[PDB]
């Protein structure tokens, strides 16, 4: 969260609809438009943001909101027009040696 | 990994969207169609409508 | 809601070991339970934070061991003489208040943070019903505007519960026992850090403890000192 990916992804065919089956998603909200109608909306550039957060803190995300993690590590305007796709990944980033 | 959901990790990706001054390059996918022999329809071909 | 024992008298300082059962978790996220001693008269003084790496005190009581789902505190062996109640903390979720316990009468006998940074308050006696008055914990040692501080209040009979926790900068979440009708202001940042009543509902009643630290997110701090409260003594 302090240090988070700002992936300018561009110059392709961007299919959401491949994203529902690629991982078990947990969250699939966008703010913006639908998906449906997304996959016919020209965009230049999509600015990727990845990070890890606990469940409890997964409805800190939004567009304008306070929190220990919404306004201290990654605040979204209200503007965003993007999705806040989320997933859990307890299977391979927990392990009993000291996190 | 002996706990609960709720504070488990959780991986959450934003993907913000920005239109500047600048032509467009990730529109989505191009729902192409298949080829008719001669016939009088409609073509869309890249937009001559 | 947590569970607390009423009582505890019987065979003091040898198989005491009180503990504050009704988790049936985890204890959520980070595993910190701490010890509150709640003393009649001045404000109370932490005992323990985590399960073990006690703060500069007392030594003879240590051993905060998570064992099933509650954290058993050894308290045997520590002295014959104390008239306090011990408060423990847990419920570590997300924007969840009332983290306290019940009263628990840990009196092995029964019968028988001054000059640390600052403590002032406003001194309400005898406060109206309604009106607005102001309370302040100015403190000349650690900073009043960079800390995160809290709120508690505890009256009569009943147990503490969190009333009023505030961020650094950006953050005025209230309680659920106002619900909206508590409005926190904060002060000149750089003379003191003030409250609000905004028109209380006749449960104001219980006094106030304006801590420099957050009591379940609850961090070292270098040291935890609180203030002595003061009577609303409402007439409504």
């Known amino acids: 969260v302090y240090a988070w990916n700002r992936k300018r992804i561009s110059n392709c065919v961007a299919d959401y609809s491949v994203l529902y089956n690629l991982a078990p998603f947990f969250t699939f909200k966008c703010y913006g438009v639908s998906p449906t109608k997304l996959n016919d909306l020209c965009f230049t550039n999509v600015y990727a943001d990845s990070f890890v957060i606990r469940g409890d803190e997964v409805r800190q995300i939004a567009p304008g909101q306070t929190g220990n993690i919404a306004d201290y590590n990654y605040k979204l305007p209200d503007d965003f027009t993007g999705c806040v796709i989320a997933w859990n990944s307890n299977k391979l980033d927990s392990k009993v040696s000291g996190n | 990994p002996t706990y609960g959901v709720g504070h488990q990790p959780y991986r959450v990706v934003v993907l913000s969207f920005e239109l500047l001054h600048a032509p467009a390059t990730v529109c989505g996918p191009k729902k192409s169609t298949n080829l008719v022999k001669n016939k009088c329809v409609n073509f869309n071909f890249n937009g001559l409508k | 809601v947590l569970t607390q024992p009423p009582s505890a008298s019987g065979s003091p300082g040898q198989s005491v070991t009180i503990s504050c059962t009704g988790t049936s978790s985890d204890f959520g996220g980070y595993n910190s339970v701490s010890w509150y001693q709640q003393h009649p008269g001045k404000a109370p003084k932490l005992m323990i934070y985590?399960?073990?790496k006690r703060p500069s005190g007392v030594p003879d009581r240590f051993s905060g061991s998570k064992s099933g789902n509650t954290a058993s505190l050894t308290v045997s062996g520590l002295q014959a003489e104390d008239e306090a109640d011990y408060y423990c903390?847990?419920?570590?979720?997300?924007?969840?208040?009332?983290?306290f316990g019940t009263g628990t009468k840990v009196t092995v006998l029964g019968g028988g943070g001054g000059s640390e940074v600052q403590l002032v308050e406003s001194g309400g006696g005898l406060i109206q019903p309604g009106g607005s008055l102001r309370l302040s914990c100015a403190a000349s040692?650690?900073?009043?505007?960079?800390?995160?501080m809290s709120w508690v209040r505890q009256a009569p009979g009943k147990g503490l519960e969190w009333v009023s926790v505030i961020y650094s900068g950006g953050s005025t979440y209230y309680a659920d026992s106002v619900k909206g009708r508590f409005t926190i202001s904060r002060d000149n940042s750089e003379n003191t850090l003030y409250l609000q009543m905004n028109s209380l509902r006749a449960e104001d009643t219980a006094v106030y403890y304006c801590?420099?630290?957050?009591?379940?997110?609850?961090?070292?701090?270098?040291?935890?000192?609180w203030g002595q409260g003061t009577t609303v003594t409402v007439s409504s």
């Open positions: 801590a420099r630290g957050e009591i379940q997110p609850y961090y070292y701090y270098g040291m935890d000192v």
């Open positions: 040692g650690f900073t009043v505007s960079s800390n995160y």
């Open positions: 985590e399960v073990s």
């Open positions: 903390s847990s419920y570590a979720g997300s924007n969840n208040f009332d983290v």
